[PDB]
Structure 1
Amino acid sequence: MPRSKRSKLVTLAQTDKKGRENKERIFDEVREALDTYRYVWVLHLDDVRTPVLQEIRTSWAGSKLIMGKRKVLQKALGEKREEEYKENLYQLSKLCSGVTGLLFTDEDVNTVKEYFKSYVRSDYSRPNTKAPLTFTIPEGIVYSRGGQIPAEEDVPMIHSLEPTMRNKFEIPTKIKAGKITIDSPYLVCTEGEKLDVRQALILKQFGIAASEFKVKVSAYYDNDSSTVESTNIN
């Protein structure tokens, strides 16, 4: 399609592309990790936060928590029984379906399986999920929290964001003087319904981490046993 193409936007940004060098680098690095460490944990983490991961890593430096692209992690693990760094790894290469994410430890199993049940944070809806609260927005001045705190101390929402509210969020938002107002109350959602993406975004815009965060795990392997373990704990 030689002409009448799209022009892709050119910039002068600083960061450059990785390519296959980092891919094969991380591949051989996990293969270095394999014989070094002893306890192996496959981690499904769909909603992830950079400070949470850094918090976990600076919690456990004797551990190593690695994330990267899926199929190369499957590659470095070995997908067949025929090709694998060590044995009894293809079967657990099958199950690791989600956003994974992996850990190399030498510590106890018990401490970690109770750790990640003890470890819980507050995060957002991340839709195709539930959010354990409903929100009616009152027919008054709108605020950054959306009716959470008393009306004296909440700050009204900025007049920049309102056309986004009219366009994305489907909501009638009418502008008296410099704060923002509405004319009817707006319920965003209910309990027990899978939250939509606009619903997730409005609770994001309010800045409400109303959803619990806890990581689940599916399985565990030990090198010295050279055996696979299956554990669904959330």
Structure 2
Amino acid sequence: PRSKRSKLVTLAQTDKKGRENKERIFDEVREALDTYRYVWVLHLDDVRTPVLQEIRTSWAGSKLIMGKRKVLQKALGEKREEEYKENLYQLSKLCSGVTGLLFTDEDVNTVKEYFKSYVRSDYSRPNTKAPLTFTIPEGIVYSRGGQIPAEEDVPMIHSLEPTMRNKFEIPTKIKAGKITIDSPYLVCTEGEKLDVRQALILKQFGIAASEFKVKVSAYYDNDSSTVESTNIN
């Protein structure tokens, strides 16, 4: 037998979806542009399912598509001599990220001022900068990790010391019964490039210093067959 890599063993319940889901998304995007007059190209980059099942609940009137980006651009026909409307190639070439298509019909300034509001908190912003400088003290570490009160917390579980040391490069021992690092080590600081290690440490210490806010690229009305650009960051 030839030397080849054998795949890992997993026997689960879900199966892999195919081109039928992409075809159904393309048909849904064309029919949704045909039904709703206010197709808005937005860029929801870093977001948790909990926050979207909230915006989908607030704008419970319109439709939101969050498919693959190339498939959505193909449904809007990003070819320069192809379209399903009049001159939608600008709104098609606008998509350059994990794009979303909010097809509405209602408004054109309200649907661009409420979004400027919805802006709850998020995780440690692994690509951007962080603000709240945290340094754990020289004692036994705890679950909130210097973010709760004295005796209102739980000490950190023993089964995470190996992940704390051999996967985050933080000096630690055990030495009595708990984690109890010997010195005080500062994880992050204000106005610096937060790394992946710093962001994972801030997530494991459960801090929320960055804010999530929607960014809408453009909005096209099909009645006038025209796309207005915006920079609602």
TM-score w.r.t. structure 1 length?
0.95
Give, in angstroms, the shift of residue 178 of structure 1. Answer: 3.0
Aligned mates of 1:132, 1:214 — CA distance in 2: 17
Aligned mates of 1:216, 1:132 — CA distance in 2: 21
Residues 156-193 of structure 1: CA distance to partner in whole angstroms, max 9, x if unpaired?
A: 11111110011111001111333221111111111111
- Map 1:140-219 to 2 at 5 A: 140-219=139-218
Secondary structure at 2:39 match in 1: strand
Secondary structure at 2:73 match in 1: helix
Deviates more, 1:53-62 or 1:222-231: 53-62
Deviates more, 1:59-68 or 1:32-41: 59-68
Give, in angstroms, the shift of residue 58 of structure 1. Answer: 1.9
Aligned mates of 1:46, 1:92 — CA distance in 2: 18
TM-score w.r.t. structure 2 length?
0.96
Residues 16-56 of structure 1: CA distance to partner in whole angstroms, max 9, x if unpaired?
A: 01110001110011111011001011111111111211111
Percent identical residues: 100
Aligned mates of 1:149, 1:129 — CA distance in 2: 26
Secondary structure at 1:211 match in 2: coil
For the aligned residue pairs, the C-alpha RMSD in angstroms reads 1.3
- Map 1:10-89 to 2 at 5 A: 10-89=9-88
Give, in angstroms, the shift of residue 11 of structure 1. Answer: 2.0
Deviates more, 1:208-217 or 1:70-79: 208-217
Secondary structure at 1:210 match in 2: coil
Give, in angstroms, the shift of residue 61 of structure 1. Answer: 2.2
Secondary structure at 1:160 match in 2: helix
The answer to whether the Cα contact below 8 Å between 2:91 and 2:227 also exists between their aligned partners in 1 is yes
Unaligned 5+ segments in structure 2 are: none
The answer to whether the Cα contact below 8 Å between 1:81 and 1:89 also exists between their aligned partners in 2 is no
Secondary structure at 1:180 match in 2: coil
Give, in angstroms, the shift of residue 134 of structure 1. Answer: 1.1
Aligned mates of 1:143, 1:193 — CA distance in 2: 25
Unaligned 5+ segments in structure 1 are: none
Other-structure match for 2:117: 118
Aligned mates of 1:124, 1:158 — CA distance in 2: 22
Aligned mates of 2:175, 2:182 — CA distance in 1: 11
Residues 63-90 of structure 1: CA distance to partner in whole angstroms, max 9, x if unpaired?
A: 1111011100110011123111112211
Give, in angstroms, the shift of residue 10 of structure 1. Answer: 2.9
The answer to whether the Cα contact below 8 Å between 2:47 and 2:212 also exists between their aligned partners in 1 is no
The answer to whether the Cα contact below 8 Å between 1:81 and 1:87 also exists between their aligned partners in 2 is no
The answer to whether the Cα contact below 8 Å between 1:141 and 1:179 also exists between their aligned partners in 2 is yes
Deviates more, 1:89-98 or 1:71-80: 89-98
Secondary structure at 1:212 match in 2: coil
The answer to whether the Cα contact below 8 Å between 1:79 and 1:93 also exists between their aligned partners in 2 is yes
Q: Which runs of 4+ in 1 moved over 4 A?
A: none
Aligned length: 233
Aligned mates of 2:119, 2:54 — CA distance in 1: 13
Give, in angstroms, the shift of residue 92 of structure 1. Answer: 1.7
The answer to whether the Cα contact below 8 Å between 1:217 and 1:231 also exists between their aligned partners in 2 is yes
